[PDB]
Ligand binder design. Sequence first.
Ligand SMILES: CC(C)[C@@H](OC(=O)[C@@H](NC(=O)CCC[C@H](N)C(=O)O)[C@@H](C)S)C(=O)O
Ligand SMILES: [Fe+2]
Length: 329
Amino acid sequence: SVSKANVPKIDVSPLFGDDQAAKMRVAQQIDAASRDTGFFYAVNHGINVQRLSQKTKEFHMSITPEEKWDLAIRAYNKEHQDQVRAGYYLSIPGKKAVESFCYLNPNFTPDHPRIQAKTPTHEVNVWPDETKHPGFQDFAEQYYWDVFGLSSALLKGYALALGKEENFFARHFKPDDTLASVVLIRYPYLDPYPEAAIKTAADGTKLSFEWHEDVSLITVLYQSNVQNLQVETAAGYQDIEADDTGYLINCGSYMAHLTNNYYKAPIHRVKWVNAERQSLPFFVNLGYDSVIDPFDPREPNGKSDREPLSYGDYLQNGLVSLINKNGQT
Ligand SMILES: CC(C)[C@@H](OC(=O)[C@@H](NC(=O)CCC[C@H](N)C(=O)O)[C@@H](C)S)C(=O)O
Ligand SMILES: [Fe+2]
């Protein structure tokens, strides 16, 4: 059998308030988790995840093939050359099980300066017809802001954990320009399940998605209650238990870069499970021009031998690298 990963539940509610000592006690827990397996569950986060799950189910189960083509990213529909990130990512029956819908900052409107400039990684979201999916767009945009709020609170905790003032990361995470995305992923129950959608790891584990580090500052993830994730530790791959009341948090490779690998981006993978389930990540991305000077909290003078990297450069290159390594989702 596989051992269970140490993934503590951390009450993050103090990060929304003004009790500075209580915030430090949360920051310590974040520090400990970040230095151990790299994962923790945020609890007492204030988001109605049951409703998120319900609204997402209604969307995934009602969208039709016609609509999926009309919303498809360029990888599936050559007519949509402006859709690299935002839109529908189709399943391929008999070959690829997973399907998903990605959306970006609702403030990326046609008149936004970065949209006007055609800056890479910025796009205007695409949405299904309101009459076919009543309330969906409004729900989804509001969810973006609810999880943005949680994420800003978590970033205050990571900053305090690293010995910085609480706005160290959050000052770069702004509603007008964040490159953060929500992805609503459907992992289906299929009978029979196509073997081509099942990968096998070197250790023999059947997978839906291979090992990787995240392209993010941090990742803020809701999943259904079906165990699927594993994290690589010194003791090998360990199972991360599901908790459909909490958000699973981990660092991405931009955090690892900034901290000189003090807070590593944990390597993780997704086991194959033949169950109808949801994986709904929010990738906490900064602005296109955001640069945080790398440091090293294990060094007395705090200095690191890494060169500064703008977030936009990091992101554009990382999203491409993911596709090249683990395939187009
Ligand atoms: C493991 C889960 C978290 C989830 O995987 C992802 O969400 C993957 N994410 C992506 O493929 C990047 C999507 C980027 C998005 N299209 C964007 O433009 O921002 C992993 C590499 S983290 C899952 O498979 O359950
Ligand atoms: Fe990931």
